[PDB]
RNA sequence: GGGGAUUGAAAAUCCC
RNA sequence: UUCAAA
RNA sequence: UGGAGAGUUUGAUCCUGGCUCAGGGUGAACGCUGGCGGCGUGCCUAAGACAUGCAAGUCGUGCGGGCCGCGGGGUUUUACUCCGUGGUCAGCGGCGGACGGGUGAGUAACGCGUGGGUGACCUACCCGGAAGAGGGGGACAACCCGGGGAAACUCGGGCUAAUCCCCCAUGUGGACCCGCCCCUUGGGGUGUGUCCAAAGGGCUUUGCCCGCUUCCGGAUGGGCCCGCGUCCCAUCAGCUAGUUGGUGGGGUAAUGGCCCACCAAGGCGACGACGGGUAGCCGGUCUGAGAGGAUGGCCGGCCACAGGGGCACUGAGACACGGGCCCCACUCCUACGGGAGGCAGCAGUUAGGAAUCUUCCGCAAUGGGCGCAAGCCUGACGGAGCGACGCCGCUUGGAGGAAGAAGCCCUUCGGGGUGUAAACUCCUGAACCCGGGACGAAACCCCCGACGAGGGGACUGACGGUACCGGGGUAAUAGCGCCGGCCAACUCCGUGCCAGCAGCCGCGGUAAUACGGAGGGCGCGAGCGUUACCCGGAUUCACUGGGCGUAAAGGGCGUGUAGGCGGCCUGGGGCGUCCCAUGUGAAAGACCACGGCUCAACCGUGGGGGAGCGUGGGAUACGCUCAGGCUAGACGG
């Protein structure tokens, strides 16, 4: 099924995701979707976590599964904060 | 959208089928000048209905057979072998250049 | 490694006395001083109309030595002066002069620019607080150049700090030799500087 | 050597004998139909004709024929039947074709 | 095979 | 005869 | 922000013209040399052959059982036998082995690129919605008992469980045949008739979880078709019989000569068919002022292939690299009857070659398969290793220091060079030592809450004791190529048309700045040169941007086919052309701007940038086309 996870980008001990739509069967680093997000683990910015939240909420509507990452990353940036 | 296309009919010898010859313009991609470039389509006619000369409409269509993957459209002008007979022409020019040659 | 060898031989070669070691080059040694001709065994002997070449390329030479750097780093530089917008000649300058090395050498940290290199190599530098041992380090406007506080004791550092008091500074730098602290104001202008260098000819050389 | 995805190889062979034979009916009984129609005998060649049916479908429930595989069958056969049965026929048993 | 004569040096030519 | 000599 | 030219034909000149050099590039290789780090990158040849290990499995929350162990029962006791539980083994069943990883041999083609069509189609897992799951029956393997083989493995007999297979129901609903409205290629609705459903498991057991079935959608991934674009040779003209088309079938998810049976004679080609040669295509890359030219390694997309040929079966999906069958070649068993195998996966061997790395570490991260979960698998991948192969950063010292040691070189023998260079003085402190020591990792899970939102809690680091930080602290690698002109740099000696140099022009036959050495100098510097190859200079194939009287070049002349090109005025159309919107134009790259590693290389974020093509409007001067006129071209009298 189609997912929502985290692709790698950056170099080498400086790795910089970017949270992707994606079809499962495609190769992590290969031809995604759409680009929803990105994370920098190393947080060595302060903006290193950003979520476009109406998509992220557009593409569970649909179907995309989140990896366990992908959704801990979600949640920071509220995406299933239903308050 | 479906893709039509305008020629002439020069060929009704197959049965519900025709041959449709369409001409296409385009500047040369290096020298500029206007250049001319036809290319023959053999469209589908089941009813027999059009003829040798012509000039009809012919649409982007399910295949009906191999070559065939156009239906002719409609008419829009009927009868001017000239536009054939010029085909006609330059193929008989052919049964010259090889090994003998035909009258010019 | 930038050089580094008999080095009041390039000023005799550029027919042009080059602070290639700041002081002794302002005593009657810098051997311009009385001996000006080019190095070598046949340094007196009368030279030949030089080809334009020869010209553009001991201008270029000239510039180069004169901050001590690698014709791989000036070259690199040059590329990006091109590159950028307005005056490449200008730029190109505006360039060399914000090199961390020579800034040091700028504020009199340092009484030579090799000085000021190994200055920096060592430690003995900090821009904003943070240290920074790149001489190649591009000095940005705003930026407070100062020196280490465990090296601010340093024998060789009250020398120079101290002949520094009195002396004016760059029209595009400010020192406050209190603190031993300094700051980049902003880009120098080539009316700023006041090198023997006709910038034109070099940008003419890599033009070729 | 051995991978036990060997396993799939022999199952395959059983799910292509259970393939297979159910297949073998279809086109029997089609056949059957066909030829009775072709005679004019119209109640039991639609009789038959019913099964075949059936049987098409429930072919269709598993991955044997599947799809639109089936409705194909189905309908080059009460297609054929109707037709022949254009001999007189008059659907008697009515079964399959809804007059 | 030089070593001479000749040559600007050779090829050639004449010498040992 | 070869190469080179203003 | 975008354009440099030079040497060389002559005694000299101008021109024509070729050759050559200065500049960028590279998966490089070779020579001399070689200190540190980061990031990249590394079989370009035999798609030759490959030892060994690893590279796809998971599920006991679908089912039954074998073996080894322990415990508790039914008996007065034993035998026999019942239940529970641990380890393990493979079966049956399911999902995944069609992804991920490799390589291009093949392919000049709807293969690829770009834009479209499908009323001619499919899509497992995932998401939303509607409705369901009532009854019966059955088999095969495990296992047991025989038989055949050296082996690989096989044949027979008997027993048995399921989410295995089948029958009967219910039919939301769907499929098929006819009808009929509606719509328009096979789209949608409707009526009669016929046909078609299911699976059970878990439990913190009457309720929730994981599943099952039939439909309609979504989302994702696709198939097939079409327009245009895509190399060299015409010393390759003609090619074609399933060939071109038709009717009816077959076949497929689906159109189609895809295949078949009949019937027509047709299809293609100078706008290059057919044949031959070469080649995976693209985003992009290098070069260039641009137009162009060249290229397609790494990364991303598509395609093709899996020792060489064929084929299918299974399945949502394959005609399947680590699945199956047959033929061929090869290797290896072999009791010669018959078997086993396929690194273009990681690493490695061998061969070929000028040449290309470790049989490493880890699943900690990201991603993937299966599982409710815990988890298990993952040579994908994250890292480390080797190679100056490339880019970027660093160092081999800094300041003082003689009218200037020695040595070597030169000399007009007075002196001049190397040279502030050294020595020496004084500073700093790569290396190295000691201490501290990361980010990358917070989820999954557990608890509260309601397995939700939301809160809390806990376990995890290969890299690595590395980076970085703080102390202590030593003066501590320099080469390589040039110096006749182009082209920055000159003297002595040695050699003599020798020995040799040489990119081009040319040097050397006793005074050689050109050979070899030395002193000196120029250039660059952990690198410098050489070879090869691409673009440039080269307006040297000229679109931008060339020529043909004598330099290479007007066909020996005519007639004329195709084609190219076409006077003046008006009108219709609006194809070219032009304008406006709009869709498409993946990401990366490139460009600009900020940022993160102390800088940079490298990387992240954001921002324009349009050409091409589709759609929708608009304009009509010019070209085009259709109408009608005109005599100044042409033709006629
Ligand atoms: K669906
Ligand atoms: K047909
Ligand atoms: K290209
Ligand atoms: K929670
Ligand atoms: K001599
Ligand atoms: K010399
Ligand atoms: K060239
Ligand atoms: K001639
Ligand atoms: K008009
Ligand atoms: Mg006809
Ligand atoms: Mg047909
Ligand atoms: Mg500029
Ligand atoms: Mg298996
Ligand atoms: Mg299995
Ligand atoms: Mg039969
Ligand atoms: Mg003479
Ligand atoms: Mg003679
Ligand atoms: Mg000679
Ligand atoms: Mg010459
Ligand atoms: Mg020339
Ligand atoms: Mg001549
Ligand atoms: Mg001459
Ligand atoms: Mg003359
Ligand atoms: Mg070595
Ligand atoms: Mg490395
Ligand atoms: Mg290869
Ligand atoms: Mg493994
Ligand atoms: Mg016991
Ligand atoms: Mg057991
Ligand atoms: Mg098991
Ligand atoms: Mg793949
Ligand atoms: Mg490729
Ligand atoms: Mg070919
Ligand atoms: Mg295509
Ligand atoms: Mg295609
Ligand atoms: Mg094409
Ligand atoms: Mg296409
Ligand atoms: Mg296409
Ligand atoms: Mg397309
Ligand atoms: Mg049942
Ligand atoms: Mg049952
Ligand atoms: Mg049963
Ligand atoms: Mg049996
Ligand atoms: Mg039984
Ligand atoms: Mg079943
Ligand atoms: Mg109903
Ligand atoms: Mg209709
Ligand atoms: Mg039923
Ligand atoms: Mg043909
Ligand atoms: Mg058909
Ligand atoms: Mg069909
Ligand atoms: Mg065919
Ligand atoms: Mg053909
Ligand atoms: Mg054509
Ligand atoms: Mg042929
Ligand atoms: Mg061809
Ligand atoms: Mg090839
Ligand atoms: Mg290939
Ligand atoms: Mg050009
Ligand atoms: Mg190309
Ligand atoms: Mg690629
Ligand atoms: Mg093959
Ligand atoms: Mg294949
Ligand atoms: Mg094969
Ligand atoms: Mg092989
Ligand atoms: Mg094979
Ligand atoms: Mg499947
Ligand atoms: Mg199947
Ligand atoms: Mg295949
Ligand atoms: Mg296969
Ligand atoms: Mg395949
Ligand atoms: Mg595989
Ligand atoms: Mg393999
Ligand atoms: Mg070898
Ligand atoms: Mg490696
Ligand atoms: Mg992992
Ligand atoms: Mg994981
Ligand atoms: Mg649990
Ligand atoms: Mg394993
Ligand atoms: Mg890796
Ligand atoms: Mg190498
Ligand atoms: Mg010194
Ligand atoms: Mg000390
Ligand atoms: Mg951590
Ligand atoms: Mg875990
Ligand atoms: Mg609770
Ligand atoms: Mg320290
Ligand atoms: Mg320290
Ligand atoms: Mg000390
Ligand atoms: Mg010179
Ligand atoms: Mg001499
Ligand atoms: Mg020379
Ligand atoms: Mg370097
Ligand atoms: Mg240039
Ligand atoms: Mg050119
Ligand atoms: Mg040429
Ligand atoms: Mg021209
Ligand atoms: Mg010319
Ligand atoms: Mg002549
Ligand atoms: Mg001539
Ligand atoms: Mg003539
Ligand atoms: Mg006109
Ligand atoms: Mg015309
Ligand atoms: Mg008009
Ligand atoms: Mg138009
Ligand atoms: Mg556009
Ligand atoms: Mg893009
Ligand atoms: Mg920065
Ligand atoms: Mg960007
Ligand atoms: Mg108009
Ligand atoms: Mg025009
Ligand atoms: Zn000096």
């Keep these: 099924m189609v997912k929502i996870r985290l692709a790698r980008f950056g170099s080498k001990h400086n790795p910089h995701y970017r949270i992707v739509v994606t079809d499962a069967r495609r190769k992590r680093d290969g031809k995604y979707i759409e680009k929803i997000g990105y994370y920098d683990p190393r947080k060595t910015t302060p903006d290193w976590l950003k979520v476009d939240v109406e998509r992220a909420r557009y593409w569970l509507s649909v179907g995309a599964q989140p990896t366990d990452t992908a959704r801990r990353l979600l949640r920071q940036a509220g995406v299933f904060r239903q308050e | ?104 | ?208 | 050597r051995n991978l036990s995805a060997l396993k799939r190889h022999r199952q395959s062979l059983k799910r292509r004998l259970r393939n297979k034979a159910k297949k073998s009916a279809i086109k029997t009984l089609s056949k059957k139909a066909v030829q009775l129609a072709q005679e004019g005998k119209a109640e039991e060649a639609l009789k038959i004709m019913r099964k075949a049916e059936s049987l098409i479908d429930k072919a269709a429930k598993g991955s044997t024929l599947h799809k639109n595989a089936a409705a194909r069958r189905k309908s080059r056969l009460m297609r054929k039947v109707r037709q022949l049965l254009e001999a007189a026929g008059a659907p008697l048993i009515g079964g399959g074709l809804s007059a």
């Design chain 2, 1 to 104: 959208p479906k893709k039509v296309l305008t020629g002439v009919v020069v060929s009704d010898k197959m049965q519900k089928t025709v041959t449709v010859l369409v001409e296409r313009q385009f500047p040369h991609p290096l020298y500029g000048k206007v250049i001319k470039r036809s290319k023959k389509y053999l469209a589908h006619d089941p009813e027999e209905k059009y003829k040798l000369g012509d000039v009809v409409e012919i649409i982007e269509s399910r295949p009906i057979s191999k070559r065939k993957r156009f239906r002719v459209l409609r008419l829009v002008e009927s009868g001017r072998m000239d536009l054939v007979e010029k085909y006609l022409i330059r193929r008989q020019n052919y049964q010259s250049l090889s090994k003998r040659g035909g009258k010019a």
């Design chain 3, 1 to 208: 490694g930038r050089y580094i060898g008999p080095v009041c031989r390039l000023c005799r070669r550029e027919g042009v006395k080059l602070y290639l070691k700041g002081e002794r080059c302002y005593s009657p040694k810098c051997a311009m001083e009385r001996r000006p001709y080019p190095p070598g065994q046949h340094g007196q002997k009368r030279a030949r109309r030089p080809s334009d070449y020869a010209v553009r390329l001991r201008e270029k030479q000239k510039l180069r030595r004169i901050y001590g750097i690698s014709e791989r780093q000036f070259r690199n530089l040059f590329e990006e002066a091109s590159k950028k917008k307005g005056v490449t000649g200008s730029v190109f300058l505006g360039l060399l002069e914000s090199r961390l090395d020579n800034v040091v050498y700028r504020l009199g940290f340092a009484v030579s620019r090799r000085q000021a290199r190994q200055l920096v190599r060592h430690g003995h530098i900090t821009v904003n607080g943070r240290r920074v041992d790149l001489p190649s380090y591009r000095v940005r406007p705003g930026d407070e150049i100062a020196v280490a506080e465990k090296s601010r004791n340093l024998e060789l550092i009250r020398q120079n700090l101290e002949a520094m008091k009195g002396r004016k500074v760059g029209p595009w730098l400010s020192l406050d030799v209190e603190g031993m602290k300094g700051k980049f104001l902003r880009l120098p202008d080539r009316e700023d500087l006041a090198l023997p260098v006709n910038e034109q000819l070099v940008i003419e050389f890599y033009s070729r």
